[PDB]
Amino acid sequence: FSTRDYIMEPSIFNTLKRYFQAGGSPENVIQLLSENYTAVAQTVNLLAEWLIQTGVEPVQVQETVENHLKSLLIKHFDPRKADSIFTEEGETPAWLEQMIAHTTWRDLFYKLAEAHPDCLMLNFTVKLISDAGYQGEITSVSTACQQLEVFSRVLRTSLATILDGGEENLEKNLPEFAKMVCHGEHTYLFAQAMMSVLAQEEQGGSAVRRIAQEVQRFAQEKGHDASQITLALGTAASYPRACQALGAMLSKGALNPADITVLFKMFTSMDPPPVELIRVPAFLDLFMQSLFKPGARINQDHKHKYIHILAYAASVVETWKKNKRVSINKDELKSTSKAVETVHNLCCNENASELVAELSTLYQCIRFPVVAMGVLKWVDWTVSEPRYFQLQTDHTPVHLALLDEISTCHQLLHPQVLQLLVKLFETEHSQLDVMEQLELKKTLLDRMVHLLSRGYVLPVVSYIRKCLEKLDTDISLIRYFVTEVLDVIAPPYTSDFVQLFLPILENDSIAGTIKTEGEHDPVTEFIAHCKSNF
Amino acid sequence: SNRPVMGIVQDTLTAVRKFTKRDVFLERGEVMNLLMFLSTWDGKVPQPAILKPRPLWTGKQIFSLIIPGHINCIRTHSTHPDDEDSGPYKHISPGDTKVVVENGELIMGILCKKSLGTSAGSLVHISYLEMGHDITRLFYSNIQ
């Protein structure tokens, strides 16, 4: 019986309750009923859409802005004091509507705000994410994966995405794929538990083991001490002494002759442990750190033992018939030991005429992948030392030729070779003349060209594109690299390659590239081929 | 160059460094002898840093008597590894390579040229700035 309201009809639900049973002195009730003193603000907002119709942007941008403003207002005036009670009392009409319509980021923001209160709200959000066809595509938070169902579903989706992508996907989504699994070691162990079962089967087990490799690698620098846990997952736990020794070795992160003597003793026996224990990349990396370092000379009392252990790890084979090894080979570990010993002596002698003289035999030794990447690591350590460049004939041709040989002999080492070379190129070495530094960078681009010629072409061109885009180096280097590249390429041309190489070609003083080609047009032919292709 | 010039002579510089080493320990009679010459001395012995088993003062305690008034300063020793401050322990130097004085008391840090000599913004300079040049004169005399 008030009839005093301009736009309070929206709050009519509460107004009726406050009016029919107002009683006493209904001053506050009258004030609430007449509180919407303004006009029909809902109608004004609706007519704002009509105004935008004739305005610059008559699209859903206005609706998106309004939704964002509403979400921000809700977040600001979030009832955190009674958020749990509000979410867990009804939970019927609010959570369902939010998940149906405003599930884009409202639920995710509410969960990520605190994640401590509103247990019912968090459970409803998890249920909505699970029900969504896209597995929890909204709830992507490192602290929100503390639920079995949500975490397992998200992990399954991430693993499927990584497998679908492949090697090119091995680097982009892996960090954010590991940020939650490594967030809690209970989650890490659960993932490892399911993942070992996945790897048990022959098909895809190699990929699963590789994923475990880069996952434990990430965990190592993240701060995990799960080497013993990984050994427990592995068959090495079958032998308690072997498991304890290898776990201590990994925990120390170095090489101990006393323990490696026990490892050698239990190896080269009538019943060696299944080579999977020694095939773990982490133990091999510890070997690499201890062995091929330019410094850090070993007592060499067990030199033969280290060489034989490496040869056994990298050479022997077995036939797991029903998880039983009955056919193994050991005829190549002797040559592997000889080559590794020769390279170790080369590293120890730390000297250059004799190094060049034995370079020919080192080329033969490179044919072993282990020897090749040991040379790679030792060369990396030698070159990376500051002021390593003081006397040069062709900008340290020895080491760069070793890198070229490594790349040619082993295609799978190309990513690591590129990593080392790009690190060196990025590094700026002072105490040198500007022209000398420029020529050194040109020499590095020569190895870039070699890696490209060895089929490792798309990542090389991509890195050149990235370096031109960010941290622009001298245009001379880019021009020189393009000029050299145009020489080694002849039709046919892959469409993806042409697309990757195109944008760098048609910018940044193109005509300067052609100086005296004459016989063969370097870029004109590529332009014609691109026009024909596209 | 708006710097202090009186500085500290080579010999007293080396002596003060070896004296204010972080582990210097000194006996009761020797302390009772040393405190005599402080012209500005109040006349009250300070509490030893070590009481039991034996009373053993510390050169830093002694030097806190020398430092006049109440001054606050931070300086980096010559041998200070910079990475220490970058990492932890930045307020507890393993090498006592951070010079820290508060309220006319030397808290921790080995005094060297970079905190006493003609280095700009040094302890001698700030003493002159804050207190009287007469105070600084008595300060130099007592140090020596």
């Binding site: 001379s476 003083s509 | 109440h70 804050e130």
Partner: protein, 241 residues
């Protein structure tokens, strides 16, 4: 963004206000919008001063010579008054702002109500005033330092007295002093200071000979060198260089 986060002294965050200032202080600040308006004015002036400093110092060097060392005096006052900055502060930002303005008027270099004299006054201490306003910004004042009001006004008095002392006295024979203080470092310097290099480096020939040929401006110097900068992509490219 860093300057904003470090000097805005935003008042919307109630919890930060509780931690920094007392309940009465926060309630008064939130109640009075005029105080907030003055705070915004001070922030805008500080932004303008930041732009002015980015003008005056093209080099990215923050090392400058000033007649006062504000941080040392703040340190001294804090232990003088036993502030114990763990507890929330007990002073309102309005006193900080009015006190800094009053000091800016207190320190005098150029006397006279002439407009020419006025322009010269603020130009003289332009940099020192900017420095003191930046250091005593209400944000840092209330947050990182947390002095009491008595400590604040005592500090203002100390600044006033110190800047009074720093004035160059009249009648000091200063040209002779300047030239003679140039002399001693010259005596220290030696013509052998340069040990040459593998690269010619244009043979700068710094040292007493250089100072000699400069003091008596010489028509023909020994190593007249010219430094040249290129414009753009021509410089970026060595070939065009």
């Amino acid at each position: 963004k860093a300057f904003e986060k470090k000097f805005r002294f935003d008042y919307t965050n109630e919890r930060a206000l509780r931690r920094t200032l007392q309940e009465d202080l926060v309630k008064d600040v939130l109640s009075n919008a005029h105080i907030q308006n003055e705070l915004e004015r001070e922030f805008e002036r500080m932004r303008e001063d930041r732009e002015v400093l980015r003008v005056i110092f093209p080099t990215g060097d923050s090392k400058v010579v000033l007649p006062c060392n504000l941080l040392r005096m703040i340190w001294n006052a804090q232990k003088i008054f036993h502030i114990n900055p763990r507890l929330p502060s007990d002073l309102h930002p309005i006193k900080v702002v009015e006190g800094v303005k009053e000091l800016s008027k207190k320190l005098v270099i150029v006397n006279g109500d002439d407009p020419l004299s006025r322009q010269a006054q603020e130009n003289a201490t332009l940099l020192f005033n900017i420095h003191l306003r930046s250091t005593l910004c209400s944000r840092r004042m209330a947050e990182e330092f947390r002095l009491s009001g008595e400590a604040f006004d005592w500090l203002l008095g100390e600044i006033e007295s110190k800047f009074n002392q720093a004035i160059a006295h009249p009648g000091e024979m200063v040209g002779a002093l300047a030239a003679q203080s140039l002399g001693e470092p010259a005596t220290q310097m030696t013509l052998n200071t340069f040990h040459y290099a593998g690269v010619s480096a244009k043979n700068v020939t710094l040292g007493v000979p250089r100072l000699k040929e400069l003091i008596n401006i010489s028509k023909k110097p020994k190593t007249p060198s010219l430094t040249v900068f290129l414009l753009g992509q021509s410089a970026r490219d060595a070939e065009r260089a």
